């Protein structure tokens, strides 16, 4: 509360560390469904159904331009990518499996780097 604070967690490396995680997600062999925004002209149903599209290139641009106020807003967009994938793709599909795999890969790196 006013003039009463928990000890200051060092957040000075968060930007660099989120960048490194994002690099590792970008280079994973199962990243291909997530590298670029879904083409809303060429994928029937996507625009209407997925209210907030998100992809790794969009996260990269947001990260590089100071549009993440803190490491949690960064995690929320990464998770959004996988939540969107699950919304639109059957579990038993190459893309559906890719999303599960990437979400797992992310959540481990997230815990190991920050928890």
DSSP 77-98: HHHHHHHHHHHHS-SSSHHHHH
- Burial of 49 from C-beta contacts in 10 A (0-12 / 13-18 / 19+): exposed
User: What are phi and psi for residue 43, nearest 5 degrees?
Assistant: -125, 95
CB neighbourhood size of 38 (10 A): 17
Can you give the resolution of this entry in Å? 1.8
Helices 71-88 and 14-27: crossing angle, nearest 10°? 20
Residues in contact with 8: Cβ distance below 8 Å, sequence separation at least 6, in sequence order: none
Residues recorded for the chain: 115
DSSP letter (8 states) at residue 18: H
Of 1.20.920.10, 3.40.50.2300, 2.60.40.10, 3.40.109.10, the CATH number of 1-115 is 1.20.920.10
Instruction: State the Cα torsion 32-75-51-39 to the nearest 10°.
Output: -20
Q: How far apart are the first and last CA of the chain?
A: 24
C-beta separation of 33 from 96 below 8 A:
no
């Amino acid at each position: 509360s006013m003039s009463v604070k928990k000890p200051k967690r060092d957040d000075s490396k968060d930007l660099a560390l989120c960048s490194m995680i994002l690099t590792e997600m970008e280079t994973h062999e199962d990243a291909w469904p997530f590298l670029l925004p879904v083409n809303l002209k060429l994928v029937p149903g996507y625009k209407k159904v997925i209210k907030k599209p998100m992809d790794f290139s969009t996260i990269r641009e947001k990260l590089s331009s100071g549009q993440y106020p803190n490491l949690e807003t960064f995690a929320l967009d990464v998770r959004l990518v996988f939540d969107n994938c699950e919304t639109f793709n059957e579990d038993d599909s190459d893309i559906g499996r890719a999303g599960h795999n990437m979400r797992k890969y992310f959540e481990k790196k997230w815990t190991d780097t920050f928890k």
